[PDB]
């Protein structure tokens, strides 16, 4: 039923680690303040994406047991989850309640940021499907940790070692879904299912960047490593 003292410790630790991120208000205020050209927005995106990866690495290093893993598996986990984690955080930022008309303006600004038409609909469809889950901050934090500690990633040598670390996070998340939404017993399974939708949506991350309506696509060396761009 209830979280154990050890689970409460794990939860507050994950929350404290997760909260070292930029506040959604910092991101949405920037986009809502004024309209920018496609060229300016591409630079805002690359800056934000670089900060997101740097913050993600710090969050990952704090995940209990992560630093006990094989060094090559550590790289495989971070490389395998970095883009999915950015899109999950983007969904969280998009679903944060704002004053009347602001979320509609935010959507319209992002639609006109320079991102190609073919990536627009799948992107906002994913954000709105996440939004329907009505996730709490604890659910986003645990779900991000669960995404990172995915045992089924390509190139992982010791899957069981990763399973052992993901298992207590899944147990805590399941308990919280039962507490936050007792009326909806499908809540937990729905969260897990959206993670598969996140993987599929992530297949074109490199192209979402390369097809941005700008004459030149300049990337930081860290972004090139993470997003598979040159």
């Amino acid at each position: 039923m209830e979280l154990t003292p050890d689970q409460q410790t794990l939860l507050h630790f994950i929350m404290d680690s997760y909260n070292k991120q930029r506040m959604p208000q910092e991101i949405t205020n920037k986009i809502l303040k004024e309209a920018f050209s496609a060229e300016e927005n591409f630079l805002i995106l690359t800056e934000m994406a670089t900060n997101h990866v740097q913050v993600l690495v710090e969050f990952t290093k704090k995940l209990p047991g992560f630093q006990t893993l094989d060094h090559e598996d550590q790289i495989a986990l971070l490389k395998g989850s970095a883009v999915e984690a950015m899109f999950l955080r983007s969904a969280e930022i998009f679903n944060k309640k704002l004053p009347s008309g602001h979320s509609d303006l935010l959507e319209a600004r992002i639609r006109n940021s320079g991102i190609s038409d073919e990536y627009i609909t799948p992107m906002f469809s994913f954000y709105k499907s996440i939004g329907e889950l009505k996730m709490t901050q604890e659910e986003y934090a645990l779900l991000t940790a669960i995404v990172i500690l995915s045992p089924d990633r390509q190139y992982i040598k010791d899957r069981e070692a990763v399973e052992k670390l993901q298992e207590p996070l899944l147990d805590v998340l399941q308990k919280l879904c039962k507490i936050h939404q007792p009326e909806n017993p499908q809540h937990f399974a729905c969260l897990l299912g959206r993670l598969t939708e996140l993987r599929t949506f992530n297949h074109h991350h490199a192209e979402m960047l390369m097809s941005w309506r700008v004459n030149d696509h300049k990337f930081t060396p860290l972004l090139c490593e993470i997003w598979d761009v040159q």
């Binding site: 690495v57 290093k61 790289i75 490389k79 860290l222 490593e225 993470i226």
Partner: peptide, 12 residues
Amino acid sequence: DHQLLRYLLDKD
């Protein structure tokens, strides 16, 4: 090669 990723993971 993930050189920068490896560096960020192995530091501190």
